[PDB]
Amino acid sequence: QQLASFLSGTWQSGRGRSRLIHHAISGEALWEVTSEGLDMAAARQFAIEKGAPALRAMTFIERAAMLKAVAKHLLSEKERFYALSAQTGATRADSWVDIEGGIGTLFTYASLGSRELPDDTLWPEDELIPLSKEGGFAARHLLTSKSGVAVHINAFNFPCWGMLEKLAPTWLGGMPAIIKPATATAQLTQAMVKSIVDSGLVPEGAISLICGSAGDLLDHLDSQDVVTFTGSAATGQMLRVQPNIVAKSIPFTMEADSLNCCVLGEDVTPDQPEFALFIREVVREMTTKAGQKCTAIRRIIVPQALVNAVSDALVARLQKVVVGDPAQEGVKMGALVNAEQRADVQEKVNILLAAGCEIRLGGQADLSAAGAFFPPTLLYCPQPDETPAVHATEAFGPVATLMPAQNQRHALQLACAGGGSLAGTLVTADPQIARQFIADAARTHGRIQILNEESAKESTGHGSPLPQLVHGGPGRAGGGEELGGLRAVKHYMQRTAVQGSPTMLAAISKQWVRGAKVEEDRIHPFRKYFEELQPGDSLLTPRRTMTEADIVNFACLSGDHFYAHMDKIAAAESIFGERVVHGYFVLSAAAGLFVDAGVGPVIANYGLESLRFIEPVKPGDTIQVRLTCKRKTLKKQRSAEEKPTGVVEWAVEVFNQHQTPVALYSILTLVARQHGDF
């Protein structure tokens, strides 16, 4: 039964050398996978010529909506993916974390994209940077989608989450994706790809899949392509030195095997709840996914005195875990994905034992059984500082080593001795211990969780990588970063400093910037609908003279009698030298000047972005307000009856009678739209 790969817009399979996908439980070969003789250059060309322009033509809002629609479509058909994930030897809980994590990642990226990405094909990331005394020359940073292709090479650990976690920012960045999943679990990935292709929610060529060898795809890539890799250190190190990749300076991101630690604080004792939740956390991370998650705990660092206690409390809890076929009731842990994986894990355990380690709970597995089952294994290292192999060798299975520490600094040294890790946990109740541990060991771990009684109530766990947080680490972990929210998007884009006149930068950004040309229409901007508004549509308001009465009345009404406003004697000795107008009164008076009272397209204010008071305002000063449309962001209608609205940001500039700016800030608004989009 050939596993088809989707490339050049067609489902096709290769001929020649084939690799077998076996059922993890049954042991029967149920797929064979090959891509020999398929034209990889044609696949790349197809993705570039039509997928990439179609994605680039879409705005970020449209791409976020496409992600949301794809997330809903995939969620509707989750049962198929559950059935196919059962073939990988994962329980319902493991399939839940994989599939729902993937779909949750898509939802989260869609929400983030909708909330805080521009309604444009270009992304101005920062505010204008002044570079001249007159303000005739400035610059700002843009992010533009790369015109090439993103090549994602995934591991077998998360066939579905591992795809969508890279696919969501790749698509949100406007880049077509070619996905090369790990062979061992490729059959699952294909199914989701099929769904997406059959959804008709994506442009043609926006997604391609290669089942089997990548052939010579990496030899056909150019400067505008990117490569992401997850798997063994050796394979990624081989790919990093690819002559074509190094010649064209192609961005290459690698995530590799990591020795994730779990440090027990010296403040905790067996009587504390911290002890119990530490044992529970370690066992959960060891047993979930048969410890085949890249964030599973491999090293357990505990105080010397506590060792003999912990070694008991784990084993008993680790004894209750039942390893078997997840279909039958009473199994809480499945099997590994492959017999080859089991042999590898056994080899790693044997290496650790040969390098001075003691079995606390069984490390020998049956290397003749049809199922790829491995018993929960706990090892012990009496000399952690004299055994380097415990800090270099990791078993990609339900295997962890516990080691003693002293004086809370030896623990930090042992945590840092990993040579770089993806995740770390410290279990403590003392804030100072947490501070010291982070300050000394965050440089070697990409994620650290401080687990206490308060956190454990709703903690998503040590091993679950959330889409709002970075997934990566230095050194042995590979040196990549992923899933850092919008950070990930910026890996599929080119950052360009654009210099020039503010007017030119405003036109380039399709956002008004300080010092740019404005349009005054003689129609008040708040009376215009979202569609009639343009960035640069501006109003110069009537003036208002600030009086001593204004200071007194605002201080009375607000209750703020701060000495700088209401005490002459003290204000004489202040930096200003006399009593001044309240900053918030300047803001309030400005609002009075520019706001149109009538019922209109403006729905709500709801926001104020970045307020600085530059110059004091004195009685007898006269303020004037320039109100300019800065940025427009359409909001997709969540239903059919909802009022079609858009987010409009307005730059407000408040000047005095000398035209010197006294207040500069931005307000957010909701403006009603004439035309909806269901």
Q: Which residues are catalytic?
A: 255, 294
Q: Least separation, in Å, of the C-beta of 311 and its own copies?
A: 26
Give the amino acid at 476. R
Q: Which is nearer to its own copies, 22 or 471 (CB)?
A: 471
Q: How many CA atoms lie within 13 A of 631 on its CB side?
A: 22
Contacts of 401 (CB under 8 A, 6+ apart): 298, 299, 300, 352, 357, 378, 379, 380, 381, 390
User: In a 10 Å sphere around its CB, with 0-12 CB exposed, 13-18 middle and 19+ buried, how is residue 522 labelled?
Assistant: exposed
Distance from C-alpha of 47 to C-alpha of 202, rounded to nearest angstrom: 13
| Contact yes or no for 423/477 (Cβ under 8 A) | no
- Residues near 601 by Cβ (< 8 Å), separated by ≥ 6? 526, 527, 528, 529, 530, 671, 672
What is the closest distance, in whole angstroms, from the C-beta atom of residue 131 to its own copies in the complex? 7
- Residue 542: DSSP 8-state: P
Is residue 333 within 8 Å of residue 290, measured between CB atoms? yes
Residue 671 C-beta: closest distance to its own copies, Å = 14
Which amino acid makes up residue 487?
R
Q: b or e along 530-562 (b: 16 or more beta carbons within 10 Å of the residue's beta carbon)?
A: beebebbbbbbbeebebeeebbeebbeeeeeee
In this complex, which beta carbon is closest to its own copies, that of residue 53 or of residue 375?
A: 53
* Minimum distance of its own copies from residue 369's CB (angstroms): 36
Query: Considering beta carbons, is residue 210 or 586 the nearer one to its own copies?
Result: 586
Q: How far is the CB of 20 from its own copies (least distance, A)?
A: 32
Residue 466: is it exposed, middle or buried by C-beta count within 10 angstroms (0-12/13-18/19+)? middle
Q: How far apart are CA 442 and CA 421, in angstroms?
A: 10
CB of 578 to its own copies, least distance (A): 12
Q: Looking at beta carbons only, is 69 or 668 nearer to its own copies? A: 668
What would you report as the CA-atom Rg of the chain, rounded to the nearest whole angstrom?
30
In the complex with its own copies, which residue's Cβ is closer, 138 or 361?
138
In the complex with its own copies, the residue whose CB is nearer, 2 or 494, is 494
Give min distance, CB of 288 to its own copies, in A.
Answer: 17
Nearer of residues 23 and 462 to its own copies, judged by Cβ: 462
Write out the two tokens for 44. 């790349």
